[PDB]
């Protein structure tokens, strides 16, 4: 439990919780309305792109709210990015000689 | 439709599209472009008259 452990783990946990409980409905209905990528009124796989088939692992999860593996990677990536931003800004502001503030 | 009534040309490829000309005569024998229209300006070929269908002119 160091400062790195605290900031990275707390940011990741907060991001995963925000994606699981708060923004899951918003993300879900935006991804529903935007839908699959299209070309000329058809999805890419219907148009003949076999490599564009939806990955079968990505939907079914066993989480009761439907939080799947892809959600975990996305929200954990956001959490790691936020935690490293905090750690880097703190590292800059604690190093003598560096002062990014506008006053 | 009437003789000497102003009409607006609706044919897009016409030089006088959206402009107003004067009906010279309307052929009554069922030809494809019966409305003869005279214009105050010449087109690029120096011509001032052209024939139009009924749906190609609008009475103004």
């Amino acid at each position: 439990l160091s400062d790195t452990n605290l900031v990275i783990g707390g940011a990741t946990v907060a991001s995963l919780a925000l994606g699981r409980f708060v923004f899951l409905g918003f993300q879900r209905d935006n991804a529903k309305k935007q839908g699959l990528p299209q070309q000329n009124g058809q999805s890419n796989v219907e148009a003949g792109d076999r490599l564009a088939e939806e990955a079968s692992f990505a939907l079914k999860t066993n989480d009761p709210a439907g939080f799947n593996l892809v959600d975990v990677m996305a929200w954990g990536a956001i959490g790691h990015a936020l935690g490293y931003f905090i750690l880097a800004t703190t590292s800059l502001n604690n190093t003598p000689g560096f002062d990014p503030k506008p006053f | 439709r009437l003789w000497c009534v102003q009409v607006k040309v609706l044919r897009p490829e016409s030089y006088w599209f959206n402009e107003v000309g004067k009906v010279v005569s309307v052929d009554q024998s069922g030809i494809r472009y019966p409305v003869v229209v005279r214009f105050p300006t010449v087109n690029y070929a120096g011509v001032s008259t052209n024939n139009y269908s009924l749906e190609e002119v609008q009475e103004v």
Binding site: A31, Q34, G35, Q38, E54, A58, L59 | -
Partner: protein, 73 residues
Amino acid sequence: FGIGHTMQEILDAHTPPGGGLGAGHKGLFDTVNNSLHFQLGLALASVGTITSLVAQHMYSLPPYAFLAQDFTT
């Protein structure tokens, strides 16, 4: 993977509600995606502008050692 934006829907969504741009960007995904000449025109406009940016920035902010002293180069 079930996440990410769909460009056709982004373009279809960006129409000002006051009607100032008519139908907006509706249908432009298929217009761009089906026309190699639209894509090449966009690519050439952007790349050529970037080439000019390279010219304007390499003389004033020379990135290579002993380049600024080499006047001919």
